[PDB]
Design a protein around this ligand. Structure first.
Ligand SMILES: Cc1cc2nc3c(=O)[nH]c(=O)nc-3n(C[C@H](O)[C@H](O)[C@H](O)COP(=O)(O)O)c2cc1C
Ligand SMILES: Cc1cc2nc3c(=O)[nH]c(=O)nc-3n(C[C@H](O)[C@H](O)[C@H](O)COP(=O)(O)O)c2cc1C
Lengths: 347, 347
């Protein structure tokens, strides 16, 4: 409730890196009664700060900022790089440096978030030290962390976080596993099942994420114990979304009818529409994040520049085909109406 | 509604072959207001008939009977059989004949179901010819068919079935795919997402299946458009369930903390608790059903006889750890109370 008391509708716009969730998206969601989110992933502490300032100028409503947890360091990357030689030659460029930073400006970003507190902060790819959570709490910032299993959820709670984001296997983008291993492959838990398990494993509020595209699904997760629903793909296709045109188009394109979890683009499991890049490199992508992400960055930028969807990281949840293209503000009101209608029906 | 009008509670006990859903289980579910189910899979038309008679003597309430669709015929089986040589030697037996029937007494079973109509009949592993559905309808029998994608659901509707069972990836036992192929691997759709897609693809009632263990999850699927919820694993652990003791125990045993889809036991994707047999033969199991099932039958019977869970097909959904051991009748009333409580909360 401490979370749901911040905004009127149980709808959260998921932070989406790669220039997807720009300030204008968050603002439209915020102004419509939902919780807009900025994505600090892959940006510099300064870049993130500029968006925060920008957004404050667009809305006075509560919003969130998401940060990536630093990843532990460490021949597999060399082999994969070799297999990408053809991609480099084709897009006429060179692979990025796989040994770049792995902290993603964590320290600097926390410094910014503590020096000028924002309403909400979420973390992905792990759990912050409980000291980070305590300091943010004292600053008046609510904290959220993603969990993909009841065990990870317990870790989130034990750290003192205000709420846990239960991200099911249907979710688009990166799976928020706290540690990536070949064992996670084929072990993903369906949201409806994960939510029930998490709801019984912890006592803190739960935000449900994964495949939510309609108001009735929001009603569904609330009925199963969630305090709110977090939607990424549904907002990815809205007008304020900064996602590339080829990306927004792929979502409802019959030729991109299926999605699959893959490490091809970044070295960590992420759900993307199946395309050429995924089919050819998916089976061989090693578990090396963010090493692989650095490596393929030039390839993806080149592909995007050319408008070639077959070479881009088309992150999307299993509900992508139900995506709707319209202002984010209108999407929220539509979702709200569907929610109301579903509530009424269930009574 | 034609379906939900047959019984008071939106709860369906999934048919479970292998001696799991015996007449006493179905009866307890029926008498508690739900829809009990008998499983005709792997049985003879006569065997199925005896259970039908038995059940009628235990309850006058509506119940269902499930039948397997005949599978198309067709060196991979020879290789797998070779890899099982050690299992045969250990359990001191011989592998079964992989070239046994593939129809599973379909014709004879339909003859029985048409000569002495039952309230409900469901089909698994495909869609019956529309003539079979029409004749059963004329006999006064409602028909259900499982679908794992919006496309399969459309096929179910086009065939004239009364309702489609949307079985999500979390479901225990066999995935009801109409055709099995290596491509289905890693393509499973989370129930919450599948349900929304199916609800919008067809106009007939939808029965949601997969990972449902609590009343709140039943409320969740109803809110998302389902007319009822079908539960297998939840009833697998009840006292009336005929599942082996080692099987019921594994469900909540920490040593069997995870489930995975595998072809190891039958040649078709089925979700089972991870065990020795699965770890060793899963990666090599070919797509050959029911050939592989015939082949491993002696191995599984021997394992069950010895009470060795590591060599049994421990079918179970991702919610297995939430299984409760008590009379099926009491489980239904508990689920009903949880459902009511969830409805109230959502209002
Ligand atoms: C475009 C793409 C980018 C994403 N980027 C982030 C991110 O930067 N940080 C994060 O915590 N989650 C990210 N997510 C995951 C979302 O938080 C959420 O779990 C997911 O979008 C839920 O599924 P649908 O996408 O709602 O099915 C991303 C998802 C997609 C769709
Ligand atoms: C013990 C085991 C045996 C099953 N046998 C059958 C069967 O014979 N016919 C059928 O249509 N479905 C069968 N199912 C699948 C169920 O119809 C249902 O989809 C599944 O149980 C739903 O998941 P939970 O098991 O509810 O998570 C079986 C499932 C399990 C648990």
């Amino acid at each position: 409730s401490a979370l749901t008391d911040l905004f009127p509708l149980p709808i959260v716009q998921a932070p989406m890196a790669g220039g997807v969730s720009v300030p204008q998206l968050a603002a439209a969601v915020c102004e419509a009664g939902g919780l807009g989110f900025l994505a600090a992933g892959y940006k510099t502490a300064d870049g993130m700060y500029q968006e925060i300032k920008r957004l404050r100028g667009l809305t006075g409503r509560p919003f969130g900022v998401n940060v990536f947890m630093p990843q532990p360091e460490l021949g597999a990357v060399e082999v994969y790089a070799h297999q990408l030689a053809g991609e480099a030659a084709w897009y006429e460029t060179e692979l990025g440096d796989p040994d770049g930073g792995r902290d993603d400006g964590y320290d600097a970003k926390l410094a910014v978030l503590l020096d000028d507190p924002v309403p909400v902060v979420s973390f992905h790819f792990g759990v912050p030290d409980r000291e980070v959570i305590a300091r943010l709490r004292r600053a008046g910032t609510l904290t959220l962390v993603t969990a993909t299993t009841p065990e990870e959820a317990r870790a989130v709670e034990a750290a003192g976080a205000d709420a846990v984001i239960a991200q099911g296997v249907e979710a688009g983008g990166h799976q928020g596993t706290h540690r990536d291993s070949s064992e996670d492959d084929g072990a993903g838990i369906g949201l409806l099942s994960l939510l029930a398990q998490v709801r019984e494993a912890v006592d803190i509020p739960v935000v449900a994420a994964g495949g939510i595209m309609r108001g009735g699904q929001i009603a569904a997760v609330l009925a199963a114990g969630a305090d709110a629903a977090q939607l990424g793909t549904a907002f990815l296709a809205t007008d304020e979304s900064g996602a590339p045109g080829p990306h927004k188009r792929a979502l409802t394109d019959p030729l991109f009818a299926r999605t699959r979890l893959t490490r091809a683009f970044t070295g960590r499991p992420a759900r993307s529409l199946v395309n050429r890049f995924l089919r050819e490199h998916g089976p061989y992508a090693p578990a090396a994040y963010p090493d692989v992400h650095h490596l393929t960055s030039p390839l993806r930028k080149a592909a995007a520049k050319a408008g070639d969807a077959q070479g881009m990281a088309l992150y999307a949840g299993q509900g992508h085909r139900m995506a709707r293209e319209l202002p984010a503000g209108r999407l929220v009101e539509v979702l709200a109406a569907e929610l109301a209608e579903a509530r009424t029906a269930l009574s």
